[PDB]
Amino acid sequence: PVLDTEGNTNISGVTVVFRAGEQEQTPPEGFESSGSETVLGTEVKYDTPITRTITSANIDRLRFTFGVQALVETTSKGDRNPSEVRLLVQIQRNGGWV
Amino acid sequence: MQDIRQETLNECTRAEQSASVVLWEIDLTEVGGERYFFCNEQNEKGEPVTWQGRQYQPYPIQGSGFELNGKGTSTRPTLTVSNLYGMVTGMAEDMQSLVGGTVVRRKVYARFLDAVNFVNGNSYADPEQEVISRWRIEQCSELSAVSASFVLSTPTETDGAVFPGRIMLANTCTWTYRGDECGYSGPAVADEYDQPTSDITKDKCSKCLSGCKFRNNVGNFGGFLSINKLSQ
Amino acid sequence: LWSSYTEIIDVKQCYPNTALVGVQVDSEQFGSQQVSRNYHLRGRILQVPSNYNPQTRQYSGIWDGTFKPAYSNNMAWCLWDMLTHPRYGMGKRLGAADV
Amino acid sequence: NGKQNTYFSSLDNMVAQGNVLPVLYGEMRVGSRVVSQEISTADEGDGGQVVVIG
C-alpha cells in the first residue's frame, strides 16, 4: 500500500491524485498534457540509422529519450575518462532530412 | 398479468367477442421523418378508423411473429407495409433514415371503439381499454414495388443495446453537440469539415479534437486523445 | 541507444465524466521494475430509494417512490441504475416509468 | 559512487480505441487502464556533458 494501517509512508515519491466521475471535474493537478509513451529500447550503430514515422493525428510536441549504454574509455593502462559520443534527430520535412 | 382493464379481461374470456382491431403508429420524429397512423381496416361508414379521438388511415399493413419471452425473442417480428403509390420508396429512399424509428401497435376490441366509427353510435365506447407494444424498426429487409418488409425488436433488445455504454476513443468525442456533457452554449463557430462559419443553422461539431478547439471546449472533449489508434 | 519517445498533445482535458486516478511516481525513490498500480476502489454512487439507509441496509417506512444519491451494494439498485442511466445505461432508449 | 540508474523499464500499454469504459458497482479492487502515459527525464547530474544544437 502507499500508506500503512497506521499512516506510515510504505513508499516515497508517488503522488496519486484521485477524481470521482462528477460532471464538472478539474484536470488532475500535476498533469498538464496528454502525452503517450512508446518504448522501442534499441541501439544505434554508424551506418544503420533508424526512422520511426510518427503519423498520429494530434501530436504537437514530440520528446525523444536516447542514451549511452556506457561511456567508459581507457588509454594504455587504466585512466578511464569521459568518451564524448554524438547523436542526430532528423525530420523528413519535404525532400530529405533536416 | 398484462396491465389490461376488467372490461378487456371480461371481453377476452367472452363466448362471442367483437372483432379485435390493430392500430399502428410508425413514429420517425427520432430519425428525421414524422409520425404516421395506419390501420389495416376502415369502419362500417367506409372512413378512416377513429380511436381516442385520433384518425388511423386505411392502409394495407400487417405484422407477424410477435411474442413475449422470459429468455429473449429469438424471432424478430416482421412488419410488412403496402408500397403501391411508392409511399415507402418516398418515405426514406435510403432505408438508413428508417432504422431506429419506433413502432407502437395497439390491440383493442371493437366494442370499446368511439361512437363516430359506428352508424348507431356505441354505449360501450371507452378510450382506456387497449394493449400497447413498442418496437424499433431495425433494418428494412426488402422493398419491392408492391410492399416493403421491416424487422422490429424490443427497445431493450437491439444491436445498439449494449451495456457498459460509452466506447473509449482517441480523437472522437462521443458527447452530443451543445448537449450537457459537451456543455458549449456560445455563438455558432464552424461546420463539420472545420470551415469557419458564423451561421446558427450551418454549425455542427466535427467530433475531432480540431472541431472541439473551434469552440475552445477542449476542456470537455469526451474523447481520450493519446490512447492507442489500433483496435487490437 | 534510443530507449523511447513521447507524442505530447498539450490540452488540459478533465475527462469530464470518467473517474480516473493517475499517480506520477518518481524513479530514484523506487525500483527499476514495473509500477503495477491497483486501487481498492469502492463503487458508483447510484440512485437508491429515499427512506433507505445504505450503511445500515435499512428501510424507514412507506417508500413514497422518490430517489436519492448515495453509494450502496444493493444489486436491485445496481440493476435499476444500469437500465436507466442516461449517459452509459439504457437511459437513452427505455426510460424511467417503463421500468 | 552515487545511485545506479532506475529507468522505468517496461510500461503497461495504452488502452486501444473502442475498449468501453468500465462501470464498477460497489467495493471490488481494480487493475490499471492506461489513458495517458508520459515519462519525463530530467537531469540530476551536474555540468554540461549533454549539449543540444538547434
Ligand code: SF4
Ligand atoms: S468536440 Fe468538444 S465541444 Fe464538440 S461536441 Fe464534442 S465535447 Fe462539445
